[PDB]
Symmetry: C4
Subunit: 305 residues, 4 copies
């Protein structure tokens, strides 16, 4: 019903759904790479320079594309296709964060005399998780999948993101101290087996990330070996914040899993009904013939709904 | 006849709800600073003197103000303005503890030749958490702030209070040994990174508090890296008490969160019914028109009942 | 209701109930001390020799008492008064483990050439925890206390008792190595702070017990600091067993706490009713006078049942 | 149709049930020993040469009998005794994996010049855990044992299997490094007590396995002492994978146990009502005779009316 608004793309268009999946994949990488770019590099190496610029370009198109995309209203509950209303809705809803996230923050950091506060603007690109939140909302609205399983998946994804981000921030806090005071950081004072993470800034990127993620994963599960631990006061405060948040997050995970199991399965509804029928049967002693007939018939009833 | 017993403050009038919020903030600060004044300060410094005095002054005003504020008597559900009943209720319920908490315990301890037992009286000021409990009761009665979140917010407040108090008591137990025996304390033997907490009484207040709070949060979160751990026998006993209490309290937090997720939402029960009916509809394929009719009928139960 | 059998005691007599409480206290003490006698001493020191004797006497009397105490039948629900039936039921229910527990196992251990296997018969006195089990059964039968709260209390007692027993067994396993191989034990290699548990068998009893209980409590909450950890293979096996059992025990504690919170409070039931009524009035836009009347009258209904 | 084609065994035949129980034990042993044979042996010693071969024999026979035993249809709900029908079921469902697992993979590894990738094929024998899965499925459809309790037993078996397999893989990852780099492995740098695991390949098999299983068990319960921990990057990655999976699995264990407790019992449901009735009756101070009448009437209801 938008013959007048021919330019506007239907949100259920097949090609726009393909673009939604493509930009969902791009958003996952961007919101996972951004913490690593901010934590393990003080300026992106040239080898992945293109991966920076291209990474924003795919999002820039989205900024344009979302301007030519209709939507379903929340008060009228009618699918609104007015291009001016579309533009105003996206300008006042999410345009600012998406647009500011596509700035060449690495190039701006390197051009502006290597100022760290400029690099702190990379965290705007964590607002690209809005794509994943929208994907999980859509998949929760999907009646095919169980609703509480969707919540469990969303919580596990949040745990993955928070653990990865916590690892990147934990390594970054070690980098916030000068290398001379590196012995007062968690990684600069770290010694695992024979290996000593002495000049940790010059260790391979993936060794550093694996160590930080190992600490973050081990803390997230509340195992807590101690091999890696906070040493600074800043590391101290960050670990307190992270474990306090992850305590509530793990409690929510346990609660959601328990709610899924408490909901019960038809198999269980059938098992309980079986036990009730057996109680009745043994309290009236029907007889093996009628007993077996009843059991078989009710099994077939539960099987055939 | 409010004019008869004038100058009696109605419980829920303006300018007394503002004072209730003001004294709530003071109660939170006093009930959080008290553990720190006791654990990290054998003697409060001149720098804090005025602040300390000011705190008691506020609560002193509270003691006066609560002698004039009317109350709803639960056996008649009216608001009694008679000053004798107000004073009698204050004297019976909680006046002695409130009054004792307002004593200049810090100055009294100093003016008594620095007797540690006088400084244990500071713990009376932890009864000011009755204001936080009252605020949480009122918030629970509130409908806008749903009982849903507030039930676990109360437990998170309890977690924060207990962790902070445990950190303060842990540091205090470290101080209960003489400094020459400081190598047998948890902090005196601490060598986090290249920094050793050699003379821990001369370390900055905030580094010591951050260390103790990190241990307490680490223990509460059940991570237990062990970088920081009990060393004294008194430290073992305190850690055992705190650990058992925190196991029970964390189980309570998980149980409260699980119950909020199990209770579920009207939408959620509607989504259960919709999932069942959509599964049956796909199994017994019946067309979009009958689908629409039955789904609209179902949607006229979650929104009509 | 027994003329012929005058020598039989009702299990409701205030004298027998007082003796039941007295022997419950004695059984709690004996079940708690038996592990300590086995783990921290290769033979009881003379100082508490009398305590070894009189306590057994305290249970020996009970062995006699249950031979002429009436018992309520299961199916008939009639308190059987026949001394022959009472004696036979006691003889085949718990007489053997009570009588074996009442033997002077310390004196028998010392007389039989200090043969270590004789001291393993001390574990028969673990069966005196049946009095605590029966106490909790009666408590859960009592209506003055919530059933699920009684289950939580039973689980907490089980956790406490298993932690204490695990601490005693851990120390015992340390003592199962010769004092020359003590460097391979968990406590003989312990260097908490500047204190070293070198000659750990000559350390003060409460110092050793507090250390073992600290390890057991810290493992029980799964804090797991690491300061104290299994070193032997036998210590490793015991830690695996205790950890695996404690995992299920903690899961059961969480489940029971959740179940109680899920069962819900009348306050929460009212909060949900109030939310439903407020939704109704908001939909129908009832005037503030009538809405306030409805709210107040519903509060009074809930308070006055 | 059991007369038309002979040599066909009824699925619930007594001899076939005995063979099912026998091959269940064999499958449990095989799927528990396969991780141990993979991780702790780079080639099975000849001391076990018979024990592996016989094992495969036990499953080879199990492959043959699977070509004769009948099955109950999911469509016609009736047993089919037809060799052509029987063979197709096996050939499609599980023949291929069972046959590959029956191969002498140790002999093939030793006859192929000791290639480790050949030894990786032992993990096919982990599909014999399908026998345990089928046994638990049959146990679920049994009135003697609760459904949710069967589920928690399944999850406890899953925890046992996953912990043992994780221990074996953890040791194997240490062996993937050359012995000269053993100081970088988790076990090669282990110095528990006064014992150092220097030449960890020459340590007794059961000492190494007990150490690895200790680590895996303490991390499964999230105790995380720290004494044993990952050192290589491969060790960190495996610990992260195992720790995340075990976080989810422990949350599932807690959820299953909590659902079993929340489900409740008819007795517990009765106690809930009877507690309410006792509160009401004590509130109104009702007569004992009418109390007995009401309590008996309610006891009638909570008896599966």
């Amino acid at each position: 019903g938008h013959n007048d608004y021919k330019y506007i793309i239907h949100p259920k268009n097949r090609w726009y759904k393909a673009w939604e999946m493509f930009i969902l994949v791009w958003a996952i990488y961007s919101s996972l790479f951004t913490p690593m770019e901010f934590g393990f590099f003080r300026g992106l190496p040239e080898r992945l320079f293109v991966l920076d610029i291209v990474g924003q370009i795919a999002f820039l198109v989205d900024i344009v594309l979302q301007f030519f995309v209709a939507y379903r209203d929340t008060q009228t509950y009618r699918t609104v296709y007015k291009p001016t209303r579309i533009a105003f809705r996206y300008l006042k809803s999410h345009f600012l964060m998406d647009f500011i996230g596509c700035f060449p923050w690495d190039l701006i950091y390197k051009a502006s005399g290597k100022h760290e506060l400029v690099r702190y603007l990379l965290w705007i690109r964590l607002f690209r998780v809005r794509k994943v939140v929208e994907f999980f909302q859509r998949l929760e609205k999907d009646t095919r999948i169980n609703y509480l399983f969707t919540r469990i998946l969303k919580l596990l994804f949040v745990e993955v993101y928070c653990t990865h981000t916590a690892a990147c921030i934990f390594y970054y806090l070690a980098t916030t101290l000068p290398p001379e005071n590196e012995g007062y950081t968690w990684i600069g004072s770290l010694k695992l087996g024979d290996y000593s993470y002495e000049n940790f800034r010059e260790i391979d990127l993936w060794k550093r990330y694996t160590t930080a993620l190992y600490f973050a994963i081990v803390t997230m599960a509340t195992v807590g070996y101690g091999d890696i631990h906070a040493v600074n006061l800043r590391e101290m405060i960050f670990v307190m914040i992270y474990v306090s948040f992850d305590m509530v997050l793990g409690a929510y995970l346990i609660g959601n899993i328990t709610a899924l199991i408490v909901k019960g399965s038809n198999t269980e509804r059938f098992r309980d009904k079986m036990n009730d029928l057996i109680s009745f049967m043994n309290r009236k002693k029907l007889g093996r013939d009628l007993r077996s007939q009843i059991t078989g018939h009710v099994r077939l009833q539960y099987d055939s709904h």
